[PDB]
Design a protein around this ligand. Sequence first.
Ligand code: CLA
Ligand code: CLA
Ligand code: CLA
Ligand code: CLA
Ligand code: CLA
Ligand code: CLA
Ligand SMILES: CCCCCCCCCCCCCCCC(=O)OC[C@H](COP(=O)(O)OC[C@@H](O)CO)OC(=O)CCCCCCCCCCCCCCC
Ligand SMILES: CC(=O)O[C@H]1CC(C)(C)C(=C=C/C(C)=C/C=C\C(C)=C/C=C\C=C(C)\C=C\C=C(/C)C(=O)C[C@@]23O[C@]2(C)C[C@@H](O)CC3(C)C)[C@](C)(O)C1
Ligand SMILES: CC1=C(/C=C/C(C)=C/C=C/C(C)=C/C=C/C=C(C)/C=C/C=C(C)/C=C/C2=C(C)CCCC2(C)C)C(C)(C)CCC1
Ligand SMILES: CC1=C(C/C=C(\C)CCC[C@H](C)CCC[C@H](C)CCCC(C)C)C(=O)c2ccccc2C1=O
Ligand code: SF4
Lengths: 62, 29, 75, 40, 80, 33, 160, 732
Amino acid sequence: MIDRNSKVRILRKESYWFNQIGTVATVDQSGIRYPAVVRFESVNYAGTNTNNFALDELVEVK
Amino acid sequence: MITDFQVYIALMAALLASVLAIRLGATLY
Amino acid sequence: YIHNDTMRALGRPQDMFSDKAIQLQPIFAQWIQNIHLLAPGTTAPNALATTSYAFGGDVIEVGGKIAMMPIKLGT
Amino acid sequence: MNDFQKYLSTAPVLLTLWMTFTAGFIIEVNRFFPDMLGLY
Amino acid sequence: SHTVKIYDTCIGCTQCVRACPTDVLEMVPWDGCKSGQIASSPRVEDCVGCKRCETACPTDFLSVRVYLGAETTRSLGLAY
Amino acid sequence: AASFLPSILVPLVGLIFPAFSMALFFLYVQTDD
Amino acid sequence: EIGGLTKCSESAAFTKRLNASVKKLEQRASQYEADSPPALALKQQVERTQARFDKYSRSELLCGADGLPHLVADGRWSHAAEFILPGFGFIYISGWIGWVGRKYLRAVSTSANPSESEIIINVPLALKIMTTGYIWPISAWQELISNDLVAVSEEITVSP
Amino acid sequence: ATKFPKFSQALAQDPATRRIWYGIATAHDLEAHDGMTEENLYQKIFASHFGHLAIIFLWTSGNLFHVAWQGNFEKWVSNPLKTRPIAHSIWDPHFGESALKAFSKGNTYPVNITFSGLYQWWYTIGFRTNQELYKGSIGLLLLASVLLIAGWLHLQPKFRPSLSWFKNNESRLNHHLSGLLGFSSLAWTGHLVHVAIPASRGVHVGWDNFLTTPPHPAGLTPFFTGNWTVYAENPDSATHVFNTSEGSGTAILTFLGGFHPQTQSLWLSDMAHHHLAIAVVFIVAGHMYRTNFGIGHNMKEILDAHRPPGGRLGAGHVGLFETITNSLHMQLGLALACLGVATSLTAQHMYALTPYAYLSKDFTTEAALYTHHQYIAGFLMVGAFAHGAIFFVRDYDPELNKNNVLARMLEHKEAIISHLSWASLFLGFHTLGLYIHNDTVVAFGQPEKQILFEPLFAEYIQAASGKAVYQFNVLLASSTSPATAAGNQVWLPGWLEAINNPKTDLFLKIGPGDFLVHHAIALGLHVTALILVKGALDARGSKLMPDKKDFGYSFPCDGPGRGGTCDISAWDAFYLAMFWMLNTIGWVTFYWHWKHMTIWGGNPGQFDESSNYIMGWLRDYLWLNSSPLINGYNPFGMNNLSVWSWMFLFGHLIWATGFMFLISWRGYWQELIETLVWAHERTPLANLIRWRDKPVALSIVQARLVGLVHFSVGYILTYAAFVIASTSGKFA
Ligand code: CLA
Ligand code: CLA
Ligand code: CLA
Ligand code: CLA
Ligand code: CLA
Ligand code: CLA
Ligand SMILES: CCCCCCCCCCCCCCCC(=O)OC[C@H](COP(=O)(O)OC[C@@H](O)CO)OC(=O)CCCCCCCCCCCCCCC
Ligand SMILES: CC(=O)O[C@H]1CC(C)(C)C(=C=C/C(C)=C/C=C\C(C)=C/C=C\C=C(C)\C=C\C=C(/C)C(=O)C[C@@]23O[C@]2(C)C[C@@H](O)CC3(C)C)[C@](C)(O)C1
Ligand SMILES: CC1=C(/C=C/C(C)=C/C=C/C(C)=C/C=C/C=C(C)/C=C/C=C(C)/C=C/C2=C(C)CCCC2(C)C)C(C)(C)CCC1
Ligand SMILES: CC1=C(C/C=C(\C)CCC[C@H](C)CCC[C@H](C)CCCC(C)C)C(=O)c2ccccc2C1=O
Ligand code: SF4
């Protein structure tokens, strides 16, 4: 399940980290469109290591 | 030996092609 | 250069910019050379020879090979 | 010493040393076994 | 001239509107993000196509996309 | 005589024709229908 | 012979090349004299030349009309020394290098700083891993049949 | 629109010079024009095709006319091996008297010698007099006019074909296969039997006597009776002199195999039989699809049913029928690809199996034709891949082709690209490495240490067809082989003679030197393919730009961000591949020329020994054979090779000029142009005149195109001069 410190696999095809594993940092509960904040160990082509995804775009890996 | 008349006939034919070419071009426009 | 190439290819060598046709001589440089050649003993009285044989003078040869010689300027 | 060893452990330095060694051994082989186009 | 579109993935970082060399973008109120703000492109008639905005976006894939199109004196940056 | 044609047509095809054609294109692209 | 070639031991062109080469060096040596360091060198060089041609002559190499050795690589073991046997050497060494490299990368991947260990190699570990590559053929096969070598569609892919 | 680009408001409303530049280069992309319906698109394309056909016929008419009016065909016919064919006359007012004399050598007026091979082709097909050529030209002029009328007619309101007519695949294929290709071949064998073969034997059959001059003495009796063997009896003797009755025969259809002894070209009787057989095959094949008569196959069903049961190819070919029918780009790509292969085959088979008489003895023409078709083939190949990419970006429907054979290709794109990369690397490293090894050892004076691999596999294939030099006793090279026994009494006798004759280009002898060059050609094909294939697969998206499909086939870039995205569009792949295409074709053409040059010169050994290292190519080929060309005009005079000499230098200029556009980019130029604008507006007198289109620098993509064109034109022109002047200057 998506929750703090959980590990998930990205399912957004446009993501640099598609089919890769990241750690959910925090999940906002205010109804924002993309609540989960996942952090990755690899920088993207822009140099970022984090992005916000929706719960459906994330599948828990364990 | 291609006679002058023969050459002139060819030129006349070419002219017909030219006029018919302008039309096709203008019809495609 | 392009003019000359075209002319030589078209069999018209008399229309080229050459020393044997329309000629473009470096008059200014030719003049300075003469000045420097005649300097020794005149504008440079205490000197004994030209600063360089390029401007003018004799051919200096060492070992049967030419070391320096007057270098001329043309078209 | 420890720090110097780290510098000697840097990629550029190690490559040069390794390649020098490789080049040397190849040269030495040709010095003693020269002109070979096949295993005899 | 050019077309600039903003997507729901925006986070209201304001970085894009702070990078535009010709004031084409603005920050408008919104509720889809925590910041409570989204970017808009009210004056695309002054976009030169620099794409500095895109370079500033922090989202995985640009939330602000500039699609180059018809060219005018303004878009071609012609002072003459 | 047909033999004279090379000296009567080439001047036209390589000089007169290209000129008029270019002029027409310019007038066509510089006009605002 | 294969391809209409001739054994180099029986090729006149090959011999002509040898004679000519030696002659050139000898003509040069004539200028220098006796034990002059230059002459001694040229003399030693001719010895090497003679040896090279002799080696090739005693070999199974086949020469063409030009008198130059031509190599055969169709799989016949008659001329295996030309390509097959040397080929095994390359494969063994190349695999060794690749295997050990992959091993080190995967090994240091789980370290405190996986990127510092790529720019500043841990020599002690590297040497250990490097020595363990002599049995790379066996290890690789074992890893393949254990589903530990090839990954399974859990890798990043393009948008389309 | 109300400006030049009537088909584009966007460009029309542009205040700069781009409006003019782009309008010209976006004129034939009818699919993107403002307000284009599919029906109109097809109709306009159909009419445009009529115009192209007309241009082709006018071109052919001109060649016949100029050869007939200003050529030496009849004299050539009389003495084919001692006369230089004339193309057209020269009237340049810039020529000097000397030039008039030089280019008028051998004749009475300045003239250009043809290296197109028309004389041999026409001689073989039956033409013997200038009046005949004239009639042909006149006829083609008339046909051209008819085609132009058709274009206008089918654009008229009541004659515009419907979209359905344009998509009836079955009827078109049946008709095109059975009629365009099949019946046409039957017609050609008719000509060969009625006009050509009689002419070769000294008899004149024309429109004046064709209805009263039976092609064969027996008549059509044997044909209908079934005794077809009669038409193959009495083949021309080996002592037959072409264009005369001495040693002639009566056969019209035969399978002799080999070449006519005197003309060193394929027998006409065999060609007639060839076309007859091909005719039947195509006519039969044209009865496969259903066309309003009940019988026939439906293409959609055939494609849908073909799915391997194992599932290794997914859902199979389901969905491809609709994709092809609804995409003109895919259709064009398929066509260009097949034509490209055909053009290469024409080049390869035409120099070995010489089809025209006395063509083998004309070295320069033979060289030109090969290089001509090979270069055309390259362009045709690259275009196919280009349109394939355009298809993916514009016409590909991901949903229709679900788990289709096509979609699965885009699923393992990385695998394909990566492996093609490895192949290119392997071929590149070793090919170059071996060449450099050979160069170094040779340079140090030790040629005996070169790594030279014999091309055994190819040599085997040559032997399999009968070559005996390699000593591989196999198949047709073996008297005891079952194959030899089969054709020993049919076509082998003649073939085994030609294949084993050293003075023919049938399976030329190969050696270690050929091995390396072939592997270099392999590198070229693989690397060119990599660029093109990657462009196609990564045209709808990539990791750098996952939304590439929304920008199109050609866009400048995506900005200086995310690391830099220059040359990321698919169009750029075409741009990059063009250079490699030229390089590979260059290697191929160089190989053919040098090999043949040495053979013609009588010193085949030079290639055999110097082709192993690079210096040989530079010194013994490019440097040595450039002497005639660079001396076309010298400080001491000029010769007929002056035009070729001048063009050689001209090519170098264009090529280098191209570099300017390729290396220098827009920013610099735009700023400079701005300064020039300031000057014109501030300089008195000139201020009176002003522009109506703001002067601006060329765009990013435009510069790339302009540069590629300059590079390409120079490339072709320079080699064209060399291949012609070098061959003609030495052997002619
Ligand atoms: C496309 C074919 C073609 C080409 C490239 C040439 C080329 C040439 N012709 Mg020629 N010609 C042709 C067909 C062609 N001819 C035909 C079919 C005829 C019969 C009417 C002639 C009759 C002819 C004569 C009588 C003379 C030439 C001459 C010349 C030379 C000087 C150019 C000139 O004055 O043209 C003038 C040519 C014409 C007035 C003929 C009509 C124009 C033709 C039919 C145009 C063909 C349309 C073409 C496909 C358009 C292509 C467009 C494309 C670029 C987009 C030049 C080598 C002159 C010469 O020998 O100089 C030494 C000369 O005196 N031609
Ligand atoms: C097929 C095209 C063509 C033709 C027929 C010519 C013909 C000629 N060129 Mg030429 N030229 C051409 C293309 C052509 N050029 C191109 C493309 C370039 C650019 C590289 C040049 C560059 C060039 C140069 C640099 C020079 C020539 C010169 C000449 C003339 C030398 C012969 C002579 O007696 O000069 C003596 C001149 C005469 C006897 C005078 C003849 C009468 C003139 C030509 C009347 C012109 C009126 C004409 C109708 C106006 C055009 C109206 C417009 C609507 C088209 C000759 C008339 C030379 C020359 O003297 O130019 C005149 C010269 O210096 N040409
Ligand atoms: C030991 C490391 C290693 C290994 C096992 C591989 C393995 C592979 N590479 Mg790769 N590669 C590497 C390093 C490595 N690569 C490096 C450093 C580069 C950058 C120069 C590349 C660039 C590269 C390209 C461009 C391509 C491959 C391809 C391939 C595949 C085919 C094999 C091949 O042709 O390789 C060829 C490998 C090279 C040309 C790289 C040169 C050799 C490197 C430098 C050796 C590195 C040794 C290392 C420094 C030792 C340090 C460890 C030590 C401390 C223990 C295969 C999966 C190809 C592919 O995808 O095919 C499917 C392909 O197209 N690789
Ligand atoms: C028997 C009737 C018939 C005939 C003769 C034609 C003839 C033609 N049609 Mg067509 N058509 C027909 C019925 C027919 N059609 C019907 C019934 C329909 C409606 C369904 C159409 C609909 C149609 C359309 C929509 C179009 C045509 C077009 C064309 C023209 C093609 C261009 C050209 O000249 O290439 C002729 C080329 C050759 C003869 C050379 C062939 C060379 C190949 C490569 C030979 C290959 C030999 C061998 C296989 C190679 C072996 C080696 C290989 C393995 C590599 C051609 C004149 C096109 C056109 O231009 O229209 C103006 C076009 O767009 N047709
Ligand atoms: C039957 C063949 C065929 C057909 C019908 C088409 C048709 C088309 N192609 Mg295509 N193409 C082909 C072959 C073909 N192509 C080949 C063989 C290649 C490989 C080179 C390409 C490569 C290609 C690309 C890369 C692109 C197209 C595009 C297009 C479309 C627009 C074309 C356009 O805008 O031109 C408009 C008119 C022009 C460009 C004028 C051409 C002027 C040329 C470049 C310069 C002439 C040479 C030079 C002046 C010679 C002077 C030398 C002298 C000094 C001696 C159109 C649907 C474009 C597209 O987007 O389609 C979606 C596109 O981007 N094609
Ligand atoms: C002389 C000019 C030149 C050369 C040598 C190359 C070389 C290469 N290009 Mg390239 N290219 C060039 C001009 C050139 N290009 C130009 C002008 C363009 C503009 C169109 C392009 C456009 C282009 C594209 C678009 C692509 C390439 C690709 C490639 C690579 C193909 C694979 C290959 O051959 O691997 C072998 C490579 C070489 C032999 C070259 C380097 C050799 C060095 C010296 C190493 C030699 C090692 C030696 C054998 C000994 C090794 C052991 C030693 C360490 C002890 C290769 C590196 C493709 C690529 O990326 O590869 C997959 C590719 O996609 N090029
Ligand atoms: C040349 C470029 C190729 C690209 C275009 C052609 C596509 C390639 C596909 C062609 C055939 C498919 C191949 C494999 C894909 C595959 O496995 O499909 C297997 C396929 C059978 O599967 P099907 O799906 O068609 O049938 C389903 C079953 O239910 C049968 O009913 O066909 C074969 O049986 C091929 C076996 C014979 C192969 C001949 C081998 C003879 C020598 C080769 C081995 C040498 C070993 C040497 C010892 C060291
Ligand atoms: C995938 C593909 O391509 O399949 C195609 C192949 C193909 C061939 C195109 C097809 C077809 C059409 C058919 C029916 C093909 C079959 C056979 C074919 C090819 C043609 C027919 C009859 C010939 C006859 C009756 C012989 C007349 C011959 C006679 C009457 C004689 O023998 C005269 C003669 O006797 C005298 C009087 C005295 C003798 O001394 C001399 C001889 C002996 C010569 C197919 C099967 O439909 C589909
Ligand atoms: C991009 C793309 C495209 C294109 C593609 C292409 C361009 C392709 C090409 C392809 C190709 C280009 C292919 C080729 C092929 C070849 C082949 C397939 C061959 C074969 C061979 C065989 C089969 C055999 C033969 C033989 C015989 C007959 C007998 C014996 C000997 C031998 C060898 C000769 C399109 C548009 C579709 C779309 C999609 C994408
Ligand atoms: C030189 C150069 C220019 C400037 C080149 C220009 C402006 C070409 C100008 C001359 C050409 C021949 C156009 C001139 C046309 C005549 C004025 C006649 C036009 C008539 C109309 C009716 C067509 C660029 O704009 C550029 C852009 C991007 C990368 C590199 C470069 C680059 O190298
Ligand atoms: S084309 Fe221009 S904006 Fe785009 S990546 Fe290159 S330099 Fe940057």
